[PDB]
C-alpha cells in the first residue's frame, strides 16, 4: 500500500496507540463522582406501584375489609393463598383462616387487582427476610399486623393510583 499509510499503521502497532486511548477513558472515570448508595442509610428509589410484602387492610371503623369472596385465591397463579370462611356471629361473611405462602408467592399483584374491596394489597415493604421457613407462612394475624403497620403508606399509594386503577 501507500508508504505513509503503512508507516502510520505500523507506528500504532508498535506504540500501542489504541490501548492508551482506553487507559485514558478508564482514568477519566477514576476521577469522577461515584454512583453507589449507602444502603442502610439511604435507599434506592421506588414507585407507588411497588409489589412488596402483602397486607390485609381494614375499614377506618376497625372492620376488616376482607369479605371471604375467595376471588384472590382463584386468580393466584401460584396457588399461594388458602382461605377458610363461615358465617360470623353477626351473620357477616368473613374469613376464619387467611394464610399466604410467601415461598410460593411470585409477587405478581393479581390478588391485589382482583380484590373487589381493596382488602389484600402488596405494600412497599421489601425487607422481611426471615431466619426460618415457617415465619414465611404468613397467616391472618400476621397479614393484619402488616396492614396496620403500613396503613398510612398503603392508603397514600392507593390514593395515588386511584387515577389509574
Amino acid at each position: 500500500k501507500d508508504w505513509n499509510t503503512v508507516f502510520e499503521r505500523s507506528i500504532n502497532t508498535l506504540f500501542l496507540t489504541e490501548m492508551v486511548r482506553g487507559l485514558s477513558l478508564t482514568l477519566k472515570y477514576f476521577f469522577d463522582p461515584k454512583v453507589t448508595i449507602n444502603y442502610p442509610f439511604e435507599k434506592g428509589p421506588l414507585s407507588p406501584r411497588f409489589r412488596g410484602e402483602h397486607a390485609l387492610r381494614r375499614y377506618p371503623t376497625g372492620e376488616e375489609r376482607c369479605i371471604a369472596c375467595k376471588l384472590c385465591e382463584a386468580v393466584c397463579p401460584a396457588q399461594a393463598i388458602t382461605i377458610e370462611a363461615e358465617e360470623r356471629e353477626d351473620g357477616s361473611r368473613r374469613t376464619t383462616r387467611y394464610d399466604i405462602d410467601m415461598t410460593k408467592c411470585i409477587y405478581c399483584g393479581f390478588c391485589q387487582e382482583a380484590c373487589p374491596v381493596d382488602a389484600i394489597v402488596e405494600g412497599p415493604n421489601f425487607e422481611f427476610a426471615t431466619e426460618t421457613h415457617e415465619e414465611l407462612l404468613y397467616d391472618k394475624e400476621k397479614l393484619l399486623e402488616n396492614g396496620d403497620r403500613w396503613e398510612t403508606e398503603i392508603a397514600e399509594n392507593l390514593r395515588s393510583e386511584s387515577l389509574y386503577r
Binding site: Y59, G62, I67, E89, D90, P116, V117
Partner: protein, 62 residues
C-alpha cells in the same frame, strides 16, 4: 386496643340516621376506594346492616 376483635369494634359504631326509606352505602368518602355500591332498605325496626362494611343504618323519623 388489640383485645377488641373487628366484630366488637363494628358493634360499637352508632347507626347512621337516614331520613329516607333507602340509603346507598359505598364504604368510603371516595367511592373508588370503598366497596361496591350497596342499596339498603330501611323499612324495619332493627338497624339495617351493610353486608360489606358492617355499618348499620336506621330510619330517622318514620
Amino acid at each position: 386496643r388489640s383485645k377488641k376483635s373487628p366484630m366488637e369494634l363494628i358493634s360499637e359504631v352508632p347507626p347512621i340516621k337516614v331520613d329516607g326509606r333507602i340509603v346507598a352505602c359505598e364504604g368510603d368518602t371516595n367511592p373508588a376506594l370503598g366497596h361496591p355500591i350497596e342499596f339498603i332498605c330501611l323499612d324495619l325496626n332493627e338497624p339495617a346492616i351493610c353486608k360489606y362494611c358492617g355499618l348499620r343504618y336506621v330510619q330517622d323519623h318514620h
